Amino acid sequence: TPPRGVTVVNNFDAKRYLGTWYEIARFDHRFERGLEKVTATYSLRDDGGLNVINKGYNPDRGMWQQSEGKAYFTGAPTRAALKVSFF
Template identity: 55%
Template sequence: MRKLLTASLSILLSGCLGMPETVTPVKNFELERYLGQWYEIARLDHSFERGLEAVTAEYSLQENGSVKVLNRGYSSEKSTWKEAIGKAHPVDDEATGYLKVSFFGPFYASYAIFVLDHKDYEYALVSGPDTSYLWLLARQPTLDEKTLNHLVEEAAQRGFDTSQLIFVDQSRNLP
């Protein structure tokens, strides 16, 4: 938990609400459809998630209009689940996939959804403040190879170092 909090703080203090020049948040975004559980299929390495598998993110709407963020992952090294709870708010408007997320006090980091399956909301690519932050998310613990390859290529075209992607072991989340 300490790693998650420390890393969240470092993100928040390092880049705040910027995003890579190559990233444009999706339009026609429907926050209500984005809510629910997402599985982390791949990510770029950061200390706050290092060593975690079975990583999920769950988004739920709060009465005050903010979005509760529950990130969860399993540390096989420590044989424990780690959780971090945060909050998110749209930056521009609710029809743009650009949120600010906080896991620590008043400090926020960017959460830019730049690729999204608009039809079914089954997969997404998310960037943080720069190209060292990338998450490939899906509604299921696995993605078919064609979709996965397409998303990795989309990220590479935008300047993310996809050779450094960590493909998350989701076997703990499989039936």
Template identity: 60%
Template sequence: MPFCTSALIRATAMALVITGTAVALPGCAVSVPPGVQPVSNFDASKYMGTWYELARIDHRFEKGLTQVTATYSLNADGSVTVLNRGYDPARQQWREAQGKARFLRQADEAALKVSFFGPFYGGYNVVSLDDQYQTALVIGSSLDYMWILSRNKTIPESQRQALLEKAHALGVDLDQVIRVEQ
């Protein structure tokens, strides 16, 4: 009898793992949030390099960080290496995370999925980008993730406001947006 009970417990546990995996994996799928239109005619090579984070909706993985940068480099296979770096003033140390991004569809549309933790991806949608690739508004998998990026540590306040207005028009809650100290 102990063998049968043990085998039944193992079979039940395995069924729960399989069911849990089947339920969880569709949640890992990344799509562009409704109403969000990524930039078309996107030139990934022009986007590569270092960007300064000027504003964001704060989340636990960036909470309290200042002097945040994101550096992108194009890989031979078409994927993008992402290096995020920020200073944690509470701990008086730099923190960084390296990930990989892939285009959701074609490489001339600024809709990507980014992973810093194994098979789990988040959205990265460039929704506003100036012609010189100097400022960008990025929305994540939902409107709860938003970043204003620039090639410079500061931009004119009128330009910052225009990007915030665009984010608001998409449905971003501007009360959640913080200015990032550079």
């Protein structure tokens, strides 16, 4: 579920959301802590979900790393509420 009380975009056009986004700011969690130059790239699946690739520079490893995920809408694809599973 979305957190109680929050807005969720309700005319979502997944096709126009596809491609690369820059992470400008985050609340810090151990899964992303220390990563700089973070991007998210979205593409459309045949089964109607999204493929996700999260990329960042890890200045400790001195390396680029990414994690890949599969996202599905929890309702109408015009409601921007999804669940993402990373693998």
